[PDB]
Design an enzyme around this catalytic site. Structure first.
Site, PDB file in Angstrom:
ATOM      1  N   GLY A  31      26.261  17.624 -11.100  1.00 18.93           N
ATOM      2  CA  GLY A  31      26.462  18.277 -12.406  1.00 18.93           C
ATOM      3  C   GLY A  31      25.616  19.538 -12.630  1.00 18.93           C
ATOM      4  O   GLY A  31      25.470  19.982 -13.768  1.00 18.93           O
ATOM      5  N   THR A  32      25.048  20.099 -11.565  1.00 18.36           N
ATOM      6  CA  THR A  32      23.967  21.093 -11.576  1.00 18.36           C
ATOM      7  C   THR A  32      24.509  22.522 -11.749  1.00 18.36           C
ATOM      8  O   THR A  32      25.468  22.704 -12.483  1.00 18.36           O
ATOM      9  CB  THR A  32      23.114  20.836 -10.335  1.00 18.36           C
ATOM     10  OG1 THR A  32      23.737  21.289  -9.163  1.00 18.36           O
ATOM     11  CG2 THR A  32      22.749  19.367 -10.128  1.00 18.36           C
ATOM     12  N   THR A  33      23.963  23.586 -11.169  1.00 17.25           N
ATOM     13  CA  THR A  33      24.592  24.913 -11.254  1.00 17.25           C
ATOM     14  C   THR A  33      24.362  25.828 -10.042  1.00 17.25           C
ATOM     15  O   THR A  33      23.345  25.801  -9.343  1.00 17.25           O
ATOM     16  CB  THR A  33      24.226  25.586 -12.571  1.00 17.25           C
ATOM     17  OG1 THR A  33      25.177  26.551 -12.898  1.00 17.25           O
ATOM     18  CG2 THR A  33      22.887  26.301 -12.543  1.00 17.25           C
TER      19      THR A  33
END
Lengths: 242, 228, 75, 243, 228, 245, 199, 227, 230
Positions: G21-23
């Site tokens: 769910g990071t970027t």
């Protein structure tokens, strides 16, 4: 014996329905030539119109496969047209599969590998045709590839084909023996057509009235074939040179 | 050769030449047409004086008819096929097959068995009759799929007499319309001319008749005592 | 039931059937019939009970000669 | 004949497919104590025709190479199916490229599946496959039309095979490093050669220790990248100075 | 499957010549019912009945008898039985006999030119459309209606007397002693309930096969009639 | 010799013998012709009569193909009926999809390929029948001839059947006196002369000749039959011409 | 492949999958393209085509190594380097075939004989392209960061400093940079009962 | 079909007799080949179900697949009805598969003939059926298949009447050993025999028990010599 | 005639394939195959030639086309493991040889295929019947044995087995008789340790499981130093 009738090995390892497909390549008695310049690759065919009521606009042995790519065929016109319809379907699918335009090398491989099917199945006939491709490829420059009824495939710098092919090819070899380059040492496609015809007329001895030419030309944006007056400029320029 | 698709050294098709030799084995039938009706007469066969004589008239929903001049089972395959080909055309659309495509459908379907490697053509001469959106029709069918609308014709062994008669008397049928009368009798004379020393009787002989406001009605029954 | 079931099971042949429909509309009755007749003399002639892979020349006629599906690692 | 038996239990059609192999332009390979070599003669035609498009030798996995004798189109489809098998049966389940044993078993199956199925002649090629397994090491196999495969210390197939294996049976011994195998292999194709002997009439390629310079990226020491190297005409013309 | 120089199938003709040396089955129709009868040949006195029954029921209205390998036609007879009773199960009627005879003899066309069931066949039975009906069926596709007919070695020689010795008004017992007189004609043998088997086929009996005891009172009746 | 027995077998000189034995069927069928015209296309066909029992109104030997395209043939005729039949849907589906008529070069290849596809496998035989077909599109009037091999070429004028050798002296000797060709009215007239004159080889059979055309000006770009006043004028033209000898 | 279905619905009426769910970012630069992710999310399709992934992690590793198999076979079937548009076509066809039921969100960036390219695949097989992209839930801050501080032709150093800033917006980073003449560069974390027996 | 029945005429002699309340089947079996093991050796006579047996003569390879096809059918019939397949229905299928593999080119016929036998529940009639490559089913009260079956069939048809089935398993077994002893010049260790009594009492006979029958017949034959 | 000519020639095919032996013991089974005359450059431990392992508890000693045999060997592995997954219990040797011998008749049933040119001597153990030794041939028949051979000179080998074989002997006694047989039926001027393959089956290390070793070429020397020559 029965081995001669189908693609099954005879006692000495031969495939006679492939060999008798080589004798089929002669049927038209056409001869053909293809050569590279610095920027172009250009392809030439003899023409024969036996009937006095036949249309010469339609005795066609040169095919555009797709925008930048084309070919010439030696062998009977029905098997030749079947090859041209395979080849357009191979190239049209490749832009779907891979997101870029089909290179001549991979098309000549891809057609040569379909020829491995009929060359292995006992219940199919090989086509009686030898193909020769033309395109300009950003990966390699202008290119030529051969293909024959066995699916043997090989890239070329300049090539010639038909029942006279050893004569045309012997005099092409003895040009590169002097220039010592991979292509005819000229820039415009017109110069290399006029060279190719200078070697075609020198090779085949029956001086070319314009009907004995059909020509295709490949360049970075387009493969095209010469209009009946565009052929005429080449012929006048060769007639002006000597 | 006997091969079902292969061509002879002279360009011939021995399998279809022998499908037409079944015309030199099937018992005679004859037919003709006029402005308003069309007619065929079938002459039959038997195994013994006891034996019941062979059926050779059929229909497609009282819209078309058919006869055989060779193997009845092969003509029956074409009969059932065309009868269902006229059954789906009727029920799916509320229309009818006008006879034009009956000739085509036979001639597609019979060519295919000389075309493909597979089982042989339908080995029999067939005569199809019907009534259209305009006019009565006669179609002769021939094996390998030829259709011809012959104004009169005869098929089966030695049938050259009944052809000669339909030609020799172009009156009495071509011009005849309203009531069916002379069509039946004149066709019956042509077949009756053809037999060398053999016989004509009230069960042995049967007539197909089709046309305007005749729902196709089979005439082999005792009503044929009106026409012998 | 699963929204992708049957849809993926028949994808291999269903896409090939639709590809033959494009061959019809672009090149007439000749090319799809020519290819589907090649399909029938290549698929039906592979008699070998111990070999369920299918046929090597099928990919030479099917464009699977140089590609993978999950269905080809998960037979 | 359709490969059905003859009156003394011979397969018939396979002996003629071996004769198609026997007619081909030679290839050979050697196991060496630190690596393996694959070697072959090219021909093409006039100086019009290149010998330098898709090569006669080719890469199957980062650690296995192949070369052949016989009908080129048969070999070329066998290797391009063989590449597909390595990914769809091994790499996409196990995460490792198949060792030489398994990928040779798969090529051997495609060839056996031709000496028995309907409507098909045998493939007319013998495939030398050579490569490196971490567990059983640097390895060489021959796969024949029959589907049978034999592992070897060195082998040669096609036109030159009888002379080349006569030489390799007189020569090869359990001390050879990669380079002196190349100096015997060069002297061997120097006696297969029908044309001129040079750095485009001979293909020559190797499995040794890896080259992270050929991984095309760096930063994951873990990965070692290519075990197999296609020698250029310059790398070949250096060694052709000593022969 | 193959053609000859003369219009006819070799895969049919070169099969059918077997039944010309097969078991001599004979049937007779009458005003009162049908008779069907056979040489009851057995491979040994060890063979029980209820095995190769050379005459069989199809339904209470219909039987069969045959001359080549019965097990071949026994496959067709499985379908003959099941197709007949499924018509009745769906539509509450016995399939009118001739429409069964076509449907059961159409199996020899499977949809083309087929390898034969190498066995000619004698369907016979009752309906209210055309009465007591005796048929014939084949590896082709054929019929009969109501008279005497025969199959197997003696059959066409017997047929020369079967045509002579018959008329419409006969009662069944007349055909019973008439079917024994003919079945002896060429067998080189004493017929009895071991060398012959019989059936009578009527509105009162249904199809029924004479019991070995009733085959000894009918042979006794012919044997005492020999003095006439 | 002994290669003759199936469709997909080259004999020692590389010939497909089922081109060589299929074209013998074309020879011994009907003799007939057609011509390309400055405005249009012409077809002229020998409706041979062996007995007067025919319905000559409905024994149509030229076939209408598209709204602007037509066709004619020689050999085992049932073969050619199929070529036309799915020829009609091939053109009509093209018309339904493309929203414009099919070009004659575009029709000529699809049909040439359907015939050629039966010369590959041995699970089928050749179409034994040669064909001549043509029409008008936005690029011009066009005419093509097709042979059992799938060989096809464009033509100025073409002829077929047993009369072909003396027909290959009325052909040539049209264009050798008409290097412009003709507008379609004189092509209609000239064509009828040829096929009359071609009877020189054969005695004791009869015929009617029927003709058809399409043009930019001789009809508004539609195929139509030529009978009636203009065909009687064309027969009247031709009638005296063999009678010049 | 569909097995063991129609039973899990009853057993649920389930372990959670390891979604990332990071970027992650990609930025196009003076001589190549940069991508980075806020870590192992930088999968290889090929030595010069890289994917920063997001959503279901197993889907991203599985499909990238399937497309990387297709493309490895492709480079062996043509004798040519693969293209970013080849990977983009195959991910479009392949993720369209699995209808976003395979759940990967996936950058594609790389260098090839034609040039340097930068694309992204969303779950539906839908595609975007540009001089920069950011994906995985932190990206709304990186929208502003990249639009503000990017300019025509940042070199390596500023693109890596801008990548640092973009991922920092929305404490550690993986970055890899594809430079048009050179090997692609990979950088990691850049910023009292008893019984016994032998068995 | 004709060459195929010569496969049966190349196969081992197999024989049997009905009785009033049993059937006995047996075969000439070539004992063991010096180094073969009986426990590791298939019987010739083969069970299809607890109330059904099949014995045979000819291709033993085809007979495995013929019995294996019969075994899947016999269980499938039982599964699909709880009808423990009647012998006349087991025979229909097995005769049917020999019909199926006669009819086509490709899948050439099973080179085998069979004796199929058994007892339906409460049907004390011994149903015995014989099948051949074409798919007949001639029933018999007694029969012979295989090679040398001339003197076997001649000797049986001289020693049995179809209306004379011996009730006692003694005479049932006694007849068949005499019969096979005309052919087996190789001595009576080579024979194998098996019996069905009703209600699933299928029973094999041991190598000792058939001897109490070989050395019961042998001295009976010597008493017939001294008489 | 009641014969099949391809199948008689497939039996003539396995008669070219070199000699192979298998002998049982009162507690175990042995296999012993000859590799025919072979080139100096062949590898000697990587070459899968005559013997194989089909599950935990079954082996095979093959003569034929090895390429044909590989597919049957693989299908025996797949079937054996699928049986072990089905019943959670070992596959009997007889069921396995039945399944493979069906396939070899199912091709012989047919005209669309050649039959497999492979014979197969199987050794194995199960809790149906203990140690079992089977033999199977190109038509698809199978037979159990105490001592058997396949391939070339099968008959000459069975003449050496016939009189010498005593029914009670142990595994390590049979390791003698295999080499007495092979050396008397040798297809080469003489034996060397690299020219043969062996595998054995025994009752665990002691009780419980089954032990199932393949001899590597030094272990093959170790059984040749014994029952050798002087």
């Amino acid at each position: 014996g029965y081995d001669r009738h189908i693609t099954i090995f005879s006692p000495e390892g031969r495939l006679y329905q492939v060999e008798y497909a080589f004798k089929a390549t002669n049927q038209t008695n056409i001869n053909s030539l293809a050569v590279r310049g610095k920027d172009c690759t250009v392809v030439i065919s003899q023409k024969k119109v036996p009937d006095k009521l036949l249309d010469p606009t339609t005795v066609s042995y040169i095919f555009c496969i797709s925008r930048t790519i084309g070919m010439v065929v030696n062998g009977p016109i029905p098997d030749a047209r079947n090859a041209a319809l395979r080849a357009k379907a191979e190239a049209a699918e490749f832009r779907y599969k891979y997101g870029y335009d089909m290179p001549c090398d991979v098309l000549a491989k891809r057609m040569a590998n379909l020829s491995q099917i009929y060359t292995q199945r006992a219940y199919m006939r090989p086509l009686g045709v030898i193909l020769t491709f033309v395109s300009v490829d950003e990966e390699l420059g202008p290119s030529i590839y051969k293909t024959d009824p066995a699916g043997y495939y090989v890239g070329y710098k300049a090539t010639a084909t038909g029942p006279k092919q050893q004569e045309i090819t012997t005099n092409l070899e003895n040009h590169f023996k002097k220039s010592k380059i991979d292509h005819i040492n000229e820039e415009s496609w017109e110069k290399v057509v006029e060279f190719a015809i200078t070697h075609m007329i020198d090779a085949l001895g029956t001086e070319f009235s314009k009907n004995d030419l059909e020509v295709g030309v490949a360049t970075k944006d387009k493969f095209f074939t010469l209009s009946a007056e565009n052929i005429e400029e080449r012929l006048v320029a060769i007639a002006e040179q000597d | 050769d006997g091969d079902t698709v292969t061509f002879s050294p002279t360009g011939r098709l021995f399998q279809v030449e022998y499908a037409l030799e079944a015309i030199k084995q099937g018992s005679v039938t004859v037919g003709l047409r006029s402005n308003t009706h069309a007619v065929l007469v079938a002459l039959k066969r038997n195994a013994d004086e006891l034996s019941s004589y062979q059926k050779k008239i059929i229909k497609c929903d009282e819209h078309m008819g058919l006869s055989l001049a060779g193997l009845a089972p092969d003509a029956r395959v074409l009969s059932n096929y065309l009868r269902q080909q006229c059954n789906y055309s009727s029920l799916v659309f509320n229309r009818k097959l006008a006879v034009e495509r009956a000739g085509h459908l036979l001639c597609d379907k019979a060519q295919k068995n000389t075309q493909s490697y597979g089982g042989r053509p339908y080995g029999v001469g067939l005569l199809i009759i019907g009534y259209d959106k305009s006019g009565a029709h006669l179609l002769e069918f021939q094996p390998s799929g030829n259709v011809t609308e012959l104004y009169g014709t005869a098929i089966g062994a030695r049938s050259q007499g009944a052809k000669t008669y339909l030609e020799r008397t172009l009156d009495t049928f071509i011009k005849i319309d309203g009531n069916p009368d002379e069509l039946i009798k004149a066709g019956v004379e042509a077949i009756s001319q053809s037999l060398r020393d053999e016989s004509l009787t009230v069960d042995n002989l049967s007539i197909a008749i089709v046309g305007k406001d005749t729902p196709f009605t089979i005439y082999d029954g005792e009503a044929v005592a009106k026409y012998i | 039931r699963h929204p992708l079931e049957s849809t993926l099971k028949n994808w291999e042949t269903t896409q090939r059937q639709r590809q033959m429909e494009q061959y019809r509309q672009i090149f007439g009755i000749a090319e799809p019939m020519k290819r589907t007749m090649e399909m029938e003399i290549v698929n039906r002639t592979d008699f070998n009970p111990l070999s369920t892979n299918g046929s090597i020349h099928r990919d030479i006629l099917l464009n699977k000669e140089c590609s993978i599906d999950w269905e080809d690692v998960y037979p | 004949s359709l490969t059905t038996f003859s009156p003394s239990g011979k397969l018939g059609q396979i002996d003629y497919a071996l004769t198609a192999v026997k007619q081909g332009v030679t290839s050979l390979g050697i196991k060496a104590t630190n690596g393996v070599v694959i070697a072959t003669e090219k021909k093409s035609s006039s100086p019009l025709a290149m010998s330098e498009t898709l090569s006669k030798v080719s890469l199957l996995t980062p650690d296995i190479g192949a070369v052949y004798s016989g009908m080129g189109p048969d070999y070329r489809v066998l290797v391009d199916k063989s590449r597909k098998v390595a990914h769809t049966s091994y790499k996409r389940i196990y995460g490792e490229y198949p060792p030489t044993k398994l990928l040779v078993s798969e090529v051997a199956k495609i060839m056996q599946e031709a000496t028995q199925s309907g409507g098909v002649r045998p493939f007319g090629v013998s495939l030398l496959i050579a490569g490196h397994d971490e567990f059983n090491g640097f390895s060489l196999y021959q796969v024949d039309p029959s589907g049978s495969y034999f592992p070897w210390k060195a082998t040669a197939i096609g036109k030159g095979s009888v002379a080349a294996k006569t030489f390799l049976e007189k020569r090869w011994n359990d001390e050879l490093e990669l380079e002196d195998a190349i100096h015997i292999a060069l002297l061997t194709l120097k006696e297969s050669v029908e044309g001129e002997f040079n750095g485009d009439t001979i293909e020559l390629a190797i499995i040794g220790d890896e080259n992270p310079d050929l991984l095309g990226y760096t930063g994951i020491p873990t990965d070692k990248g290519p075990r197999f190297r296609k020698l250029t005409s310059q790398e070949i013309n250096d060694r052709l100075e000593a022969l | 499957s193959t053609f000859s120089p003369e219009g006819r199938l070799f895969q049919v003709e070169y099969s059918l010549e077997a039944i010309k040396l097969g078991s001599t089955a004979i049937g007779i129709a009458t005003k009162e019912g049908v008779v069907l009868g056979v040489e009851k040949r057995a491979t040994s006195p060890l063979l029980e009945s209820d095995s190769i029954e050379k005459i069989v029921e199809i339904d209470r209205h219909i039987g069969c008898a045959m001359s080549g390998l019965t097990a071949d036609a026994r496959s067709m007879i499985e379908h003959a039985r099941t197709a007949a009773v499924t018509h009745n199960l769906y539509y509450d009627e016995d399939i009118n006999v001739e429409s069964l005879t076509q449907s059961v003899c159409d199996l020899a066309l499977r949809r083309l030119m087929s390898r034969p069931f190498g066995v000619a066949l004698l369907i016979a039975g009752h309906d209210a459309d055309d009465g007591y009906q005796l048929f014939h069926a084949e590896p082709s596709g054929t019929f009969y209606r109501y008279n005497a007919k025969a199959i197997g070695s003696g059959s066409e020689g017997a047929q020369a007397e079967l045509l002579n010795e018959w008329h419409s008004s006969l009662t069944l017992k007349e055909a019973e002693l008439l079917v024994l007189k003919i079945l002896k004609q060429v067998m080189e043998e004493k017929l009895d309930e071991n060398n012959a088997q019989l059936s009578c086929i009527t509105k009162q009996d249904g199809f029924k096969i004479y019991d070995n005891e009733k085959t000894a009172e009918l042979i006794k009746e012919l044997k005492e009639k020999e003095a006439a | 010799t002994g290669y003759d027995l199936s469709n997909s077998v080259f004999s020692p000189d590389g010939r497909n013998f089922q081109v060589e034995y299929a074209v013998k069927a074309v020879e011994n069928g009907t003799t007939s012709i057609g011509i390309k015209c400055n405005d249009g296309v012409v077809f002229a066909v020998e409706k041979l009569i062996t007995s007067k029992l025919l319905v000559p109104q409905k024994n149509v030997k030229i076939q209408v193909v598209d709204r602007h395209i037509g066709c004619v043939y020689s050999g085992l005729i049932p073969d050619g009926r199929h070529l036309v039949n799915r020829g009609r849907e091939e053109a009509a589906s093209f018309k339904k999809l493309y929203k414009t008529p099919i070009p004659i070069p575009a029709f000529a290849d699809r049909l040439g390929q359907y015939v050629q596809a039966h010369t590959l496998y041995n699970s089928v035989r050749p179409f034994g029948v040669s064909t001549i077909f043509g029409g008008v599109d936005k690029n011009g009037a066009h005419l093509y001839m097709l042979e059992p091999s799938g060989s096809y070429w464009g033509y100025k004028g073409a002829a077929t059947g047993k009369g072909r050798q003396s027909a290959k002296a009325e052909l040539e000797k049209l264009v050798d006196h008409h290097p412009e060709g003709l507008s379609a009215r004189e092509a209609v007239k000239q064509a009828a002369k040829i096929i009359y004159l071609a009877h020189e080889d054969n005695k004791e059979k009869d015929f009617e000749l029927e003709i058809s055309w399409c043009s930019l000006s001789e009809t508004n770009g539609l195929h139509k039959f030529v009978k009636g006043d203009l065909l009687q004028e064309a027969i009247d033209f031709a009638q005296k011409e063999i009678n010049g000898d | 492949s569909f097995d063991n279905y129609q039973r899990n619905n009853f057993l649920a009426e389930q372990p959670k999958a390891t979604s990332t769910g990071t970027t992650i970012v990609g930025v196009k630069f003076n001589n190549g393209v940069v991508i980075a992710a806020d870590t192992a999310k930088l999968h290889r399709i090929s030595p010069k085509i890289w994917c920063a992934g997001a959503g279901t992690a197993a889907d991203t590793e599985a499909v990238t190594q399937l497309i990387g198999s297709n493309i490895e076979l492709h480079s062996l079937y043509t004798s040519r380097e693969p293209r970013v548009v080849s990977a983009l076509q195959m991910l479009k066809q392949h993720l369209f075939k699995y209808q976003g039921h395979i759940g990967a969100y996936l950058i594609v960036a790389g260098v090839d004989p034609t040039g340097s390219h930068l694309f992204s695949i969303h779950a539906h097989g839908s595609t975007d392209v540009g001089y920069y992209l950011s994906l995985g839930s932190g990206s709304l801050a990186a929208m502003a960061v990249l639009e503000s501080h990017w300019k025509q032709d940042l070199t390596k150093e500023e693109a890596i400093k801008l990548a640092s800033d973009a991922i920092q917006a929305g404490s550690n980073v993986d970055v890899c940079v594809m430079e048009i003449g050179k090997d692609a560069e990979y950088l990691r974390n850049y910023l009292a009962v008893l019984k016994e027996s032998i068995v | 079909v004709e060459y195929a029945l010569e496969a049966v005429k190349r196969g081992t002699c197999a024989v049997g007799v009905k009785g009033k309340n049993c059937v006995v089947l047996g075969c000439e079996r070539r004992s063991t080949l010096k180094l073969q093991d009986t426990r590791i050796t298939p019987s010739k006579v083969s069970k299809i179900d607890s109330h059904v047996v099949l014995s045979f003569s000819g291709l033993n390879a085809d007979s495995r697949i013929l019995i294996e096809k019969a075994r899947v059918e016999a269980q499938s019939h039982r599964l699909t009805l709880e009808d423990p397949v009647t012998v006349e229905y087991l025979t229909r299928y097995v005769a049917g598969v020999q019909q199926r593999y006669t009819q086509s080119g490709g899948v050439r016929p099973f080179g085998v003939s069979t004796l199929i036998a058994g007892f339906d529940p409460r049907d004390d009639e011994p149903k015995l059926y014989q099948t051949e490559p074409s798919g007949i089913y001639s029933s018999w009260s007694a029969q012979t298949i295989g090679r040398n079956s001339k003197t076997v069939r001649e000797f049986l048809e001289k020693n049995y009447d179809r209306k004379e089935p011996p009730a006692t398993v003694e005479e049932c077994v006694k007849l068949t050993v005499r019969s096979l002893l005309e052919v087996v010049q190789t001595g009576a260790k080579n024979i194998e025999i098996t019996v069905v009594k009703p209600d699933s009492d299928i029973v094999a006979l041991s190598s000792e028990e058939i001897n109490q029958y070989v050395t019961q017949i042998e001295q009976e034959k010597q008493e017939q010599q001294e008489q | 005639e009641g014969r099949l000519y391809q199948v008689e020639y497939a039996l003539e095919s396995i008669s070219h394939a070199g000699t192979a032996i298998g002998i049982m013991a009162s507690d175990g089974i042995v296999l012993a195959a000859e590799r025919k005359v072979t080139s100096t450059l062949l590898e000697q431990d990587t070459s899968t030639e005559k013997l194989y392992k089909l599950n935990d508890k079954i082996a095979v000693a093959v003569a034929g086309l090895t390429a044909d045999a590989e597919i049957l060997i693989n299908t025996a592995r797949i079937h054996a493991q699928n049986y072990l997954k089905t019943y959670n219990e070992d596959i009997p040797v007889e069921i396995l040889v039945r399944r493979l011998s069906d396939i070899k008749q199912g091709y012989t049933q047919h005209g669309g295929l050649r039959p497999f040119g492979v014979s197969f001597i199987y050794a194995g153990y199960d809790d149906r019947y203990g140690y079992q030794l089977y033999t199977s041939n190109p038509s698809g028949n199978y037979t159990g044995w105490k001592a058997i051979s396949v391939g070339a000179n099968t008959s000459a080998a069975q003449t050496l087995l016939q009189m010498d074989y005593k029914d009670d002997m142990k595994v390590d006694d049979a390791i003698e008789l295999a080499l007495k047989t092979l050396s008397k039926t040798t297809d080469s001027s003489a034996l060397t340790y690299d020219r043969l393959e062996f595998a054995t089956i025994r009752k665990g290390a002691n009780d419980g499981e089954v032990y199932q070793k393949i001899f590597k070429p030094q272990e093959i020397k170790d059984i040749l130093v014994k029952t050798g020559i002087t």
